[PDB]
């Protein structure tokens, strides 16, 4: 209902966790499990690549279509670009339906 491609076998979930590292266990033995660990985090790059297939547009309509066009009027901030403080902002939602096929 939200949108997109209903799949029976979606791209599988990728779960990730830091392996816990204990911290300074006492010398004498105790059965209770460790309540204290090294405080640590991890970081690194992630690369996702998807190959899309397209349906080429083949039509005979005479007059020109509607297209998605960023307006040419001068403004303080360009759309879809960083501002002066570095905060990237999307100005408006972009639907996918512009080209026109006859019903």
């Amino acid at each position: 209902l939200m949108g997109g491609f209903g799949l029976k076998h979606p791209p599988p979930q990728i779960l990730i966790k830091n392996t816990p590292v204990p911290a300074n266990p006492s010398t004498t033995f105790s059965a209770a499990k460790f309540a204290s660990f090294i405080t640590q985090y991890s970081t690194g790059q992630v690369s996702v690549e998807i190959e899309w297939e397209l349906q080429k547009e083949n039509s005979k309509r005479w007059n020109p279509e509607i297209q998605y066009t960023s307006n040419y009027n001068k403004s303080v901030n360009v759309d879809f670009t960083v501002d002066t403080n570095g905060v990237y902002s999307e100005p408006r939602p972009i639907g996918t339906r512009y080209l026109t096929r006859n019903l």
Binding site: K60, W62, E65
Partner: protein, 103 residues
């Protein structure tokens, strides 16, 4: 046909042509879906007039929304036929369930 103050006389024009095309790519408004007149007559002795072709598009009131697309038919490839040429095409139907004539 020539008209001269009445007594119009029809005299065959050998040189003139008649141009025909079948789309087969379904790039035109499909008019044939709804019941209409001008089909082939039931009884083979009859002679029938070939109906005009027009189509409707999106609209607001009587005015036309920018979405409406106007198709020019002249813009397809079409075979031209003088007297003594014949235009034949063959079409094969996709498999479709039987019509049920039983009760």
């Amino acid at each position: 046909v020539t008209q001269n103050d009445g007594t119009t006389t029809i005299a065959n024009n050998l040189t003139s042509t008649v141009q025909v095309f079948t789309d087969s790519e379904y790039q035109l408004p499909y008019v044939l879906g709804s019941a209409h007149q001008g089909c082939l007559p039931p009884f083979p002795a009859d002679v029938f007039m070939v109906p005009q072709y027009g189509y409707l598009t999106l609209n607001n009131g009587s005015q036309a929304v920018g979405r409406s697309s106007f198709y020019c038919l002249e813009y397809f490839p079409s075979q031209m036929l003088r007297t003594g040429n014949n235009f034949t095409f063959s079409y094969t139907f996709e498999d479709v369930p039987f019509h049920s004539s039983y009760a």
